[PDB]
Structures are given as C-alpha cells and as structure tokens.
Design an enzyme around this catalytic site. Structure first.
Site, PDB file in Angstrom:
ATOM      1  N   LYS A   7       0.390  -1.110   0.226  1.00 48.37           N
ATOM      2  CA  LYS A   7       0.294  -0.345  -0.083  1.00 48.37           C
ATOM      3  C   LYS A   7       1.102   1.195  -0.167  1.00 48.37           C
ATOM      4  O   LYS A   7       0.331   2.040  -0.865  1.00 48.37           O
ATOM      5  CB  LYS A   7      -0.989   0.167   1.736  1.00 48.37           C
ATOM      6  N   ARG A  10       2.548   1.320  -3.913  1.00 46.92           N
ATOM      7  CA  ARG A  10       0.930   2.206  -4.052  1.00 46.92           C
ATOM      8  C   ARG A  10       0.889   3.598  -3.870  1.00 46.92           C
ATOM      9  O   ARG A  10       0.506   4.431  -5.226  1.00 46.92           O
ATOM     10  CB  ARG A  10       0.031   1.368  -4.321  1.00 46.92           C
ATOM     11  N   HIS A  12       2.842   6.009  -2.630  1.00 52.74           N
ATOM     12  CA  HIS A  12       3.859   7.048  -2.096  1.00 52.74           C
ATOM     13  C   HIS A  12       5.077   6.957  -3.252  1.00 52.74           C
ATOM     14  O   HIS A  12       5.561   7.886  -2.687  1.00 52.74           O
ATOM     15  CB  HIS A  12       4.210   7.009  -1.308  1.00 52.74           C
ATOM     16  N   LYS A  41      -8.587  11.617  -2.105  1.00 50.54           N
ATOM     17  CA  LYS A  41      -7.770  11.753  -0.539  1.00 50.54           C
ATOM     18  C   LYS A  41      -7.338  12.913  -0.725  1.00 50.54           C
ATOM     19  O   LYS A  41      -7.121  13.408  -2.211  1.00 50.54           O
ATOM     20  CB  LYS A  41      -6.559   9.917  -0.918  1.00 50.54           C
ATOM     21  N   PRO A  42      -7.946  13.818   0.250  1.00 50.74           N
ATOM     22  CA  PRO A  42      -7.212  15.369  -0.146  1.00 50.74           C
ATOM     23  C   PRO A  42      -5.777  15.927   0.052  1.00 50.74           C
ATOM     24  O   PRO A  42      -5.333  16.234  -1.222  1.00 50.74           O
ATOM     25  CB  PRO A  42      -7.526  15.769   1.803  1.00 50.74           C
ATOM     26  N   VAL A  43      -4.600  14.993   0.421  1.00 52.38           N
ATOM     27  CA  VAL A  43      -3.625  15.405   0.141  1.00 52.38           C
ATOM     28  C   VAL A  43      -2.908  14.430   0.058  1.00 52.38           C
ATOM     29  O   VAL A  43      -2.827  13.123   0.846  1.00 52.38           O
ATOM     30  CB  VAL A  43      -2.947  16.338   1.565  1.00 52.38           C
ATOM     31  N   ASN A  44      -1.754  14.193  -0.295  1.00 58.10           N
ATOM     32  CA  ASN A  44      -0.759  13.024  -0.494  1.00 58.10           C
ATOM     33  C   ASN A  44       0.890  13.181  -1.393  1.00 58.10           C
ATOM     34  O   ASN A  44       0.644  14.434  -2.095  1.00 58.10           O
ATOM     35  CB  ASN A  44      -1.675  11.698  -1.806  1.00 58.10           C
ATOM     36  N   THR A  45       1.901  12.359  -1.035  1.00 63.95           N
ATOM     37  CA  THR A  45       3.011  13.248  -1.628  1.00 63.95           C
ATOM     38  C   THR A  45       3.513  11.447  -2.477  1.00 63.95           C
ATOM     39  O   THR A  45       3.770  10.677  -1.356  1.00 63.95           O
ATOM     40  CB  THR A  45       3.727  13.222  -0.582  1.00 63.95           C
ATOM     41  N   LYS A  66       3.515  12.143  14.245  1.00 65.65           N
ATOM     42  CA  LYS A  66       2.630  12.677  14.395  1.00 65.65           C
ATOM     43  C   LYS A  66       2.006  12.435  15.366  1.00 65.65           C
ATOM     44  O   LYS A  66       1.155  13.973  15.605  1.00 65.65           O
ATOM     45  CB  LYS A  66       2.129  13.466  12.959  1.00 65.65           C
ATOM     46  N   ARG A  85      -2.359  18.470  -4.126  1.00 74.88           N
ATOM     47  CA  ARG A  85      -3.693  19.538  -2.475  1.00 74.88           C
ATOM     48  C   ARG A  85      -4.390  19.073  -3.308  1.00 74.88           C
ATOM     49  O   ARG A  85      -4.319  19.515  -4.162  1.00 74.88           O
ATOM     50  CB  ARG A  85      -2.566  19.859  -2.301  1.00 74.88           C
ATOM     51  N   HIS A 119       3.820   3.929   6.097  1.00 77.50           N
ATOM     52  CA  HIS A 119       3.419   5.465   6.269  1.00 77.50           C
ATOM     53  C   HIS A 119       3.901   6.426   6.134  1.00 77.50           C
ATOM     54  O   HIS A 119       5.452   6.424   6.399  1.00 77.50           O
ATOM     55  CB  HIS A 119       2.511   5.103   7.478  1.00 77.50           C
ATOM     56  N   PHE A 120       3.271   7.468   5.159  1.00 80.03           N
ATOM     57  CA  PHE A 120       3.911   8.622   4.654  1.00 80.03           C
ATOM     58  C   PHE A 120       3.823   9.362   6.095  1.00 80.03           C
ATOM     59  O   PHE A 120       2.373   9.988   6.214  1.00 80.03           O
ATOM     60  CB  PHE A 120       4.179   8.856   3.841  1.00 80.03           C
ATOM     61  N   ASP A 121       4.609  10.106   7.220  1.00 79.70           N
ATOM     62  CA  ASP A 121       3.771  11.552   7.792  1.00 79.70           C
ATOM     63  C   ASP A 121       4.953  12.133   7.616  1.00 79.70           C
ATOM     64  O   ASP A 121       3.903  13.410   7.923  1.00 79.70           O
ATOM     65  CB  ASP A 121       4.979  11.332   9.433  1.00 79.70           C
TER      66      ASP A 121
END
Ligand code: AMP
Length: 124
Positions: A7, A10, A12, A41-45, A66, A85, A119-121
């Site tokens: 995941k 996929r 990040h 999805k609101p935000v993603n990197t 976080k 964004r 997880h991308f923090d």
C-alpha cells in the site's frame, strides 16, 4: 491481498520520473493509484527515488511520529518529491489537485520484518 508495505508503494512511490512532474501529474496519479476511487484523498505525497533509497530511510534518523509513535525516520538526504493537494473546486468523482515538486527530507513510519515503510508522515 495488499500488504501495508505494498500500500505504501502504491500510494507513495514513483521512481519512474525524476520529478519533471507536469501540472497534470497529481490529477493523473491520484486517480491511477486508486486514491480517488472512494473519495478524493485530500493530500498525498509521491517520492521520486529508488525503492531501495526509500526503504533505507527506516534505518536513518529516528524522529517522533505525528501520532506520537516512535517508529518514524527522517531521510539524511533530501529527496525529490511531489505534493498533491486537492483544489477548492475539486469535486469527487472528478478529483482535482495542485501539483508541487520540491526537494525535501522525508519522514516515514516503518513496521514489520523486514522493517519497511508503511506510512508517509511528513516532509521537512
Ligand atoms: N507511526 C505510524 N506507524 C504506522 N502507521 C501509521 C503511523 N502513523 C499513522 N499511521 C497510519 O498509516 C496509514 C498509512 O498512511 P498514509 O501513508 O498517509 O496512507 C494511515 O492510515 C495512518 O493513519
């Protein structure tokens, strides 16, 4: 089934481009990586480095997450990344994003054996 490690890949990873990320990039990638199927999805990197280099971050600088967990790691080097964004006018199913390339240190949370990103923090 899709593991947390898969995941993360996929959601990040995008090693295919160095990050000449076009203005269209987020619009296309958010959709194609299935991050707009259920909602926008609101935000993603996305990270434009090799998988090996991103996996290596799990043995780099340990920093607080976080959410207060202790399993986060900051990259020693900056990495090429693209922030996506959601725009104010974006409306699911037609999700619209602002694409912003940057070179920043990434912070990822790692778990498992092997110990890999799940997880991308943050980017800093
Ligand atoms: N320290 C952590 N370790 C593992 N997973 C986390 C951590 N912090 C947040 N998460 C969750 O991991 C999932 C993957 O995040 P993302 O990479 O943002 O899709 C999210 O649902 C986060 O809430």
């Amino acid at each position: 089934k899709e593991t947390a490690a898969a995941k993360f890949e996929r959601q990040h990873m995008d090693s295919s481009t160095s990050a000449a990320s076009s203005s269209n990039y987020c619009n296309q990638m958010m959709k194609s990586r299935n991050l707009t199927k259920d909602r926008c999805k609101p935000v993603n990197t996305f990270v434009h480095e090799s998988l090996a280099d991103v996996q290596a971050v799990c043995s780099q600088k340990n920093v607080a997450c976080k959410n207060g967990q202790t399993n986060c790691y900051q990259s020693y080097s900056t990495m090429s990344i693209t922030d996506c964004r959601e725009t104010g006018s974006s409306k699911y199913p037609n999700c619209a994003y602002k694409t912003t390339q940057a070179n920043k240190h990434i912070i990822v949370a790692c778990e498992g054996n092997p110990y890999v990103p799940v997880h991308f923090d943050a980017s800093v």
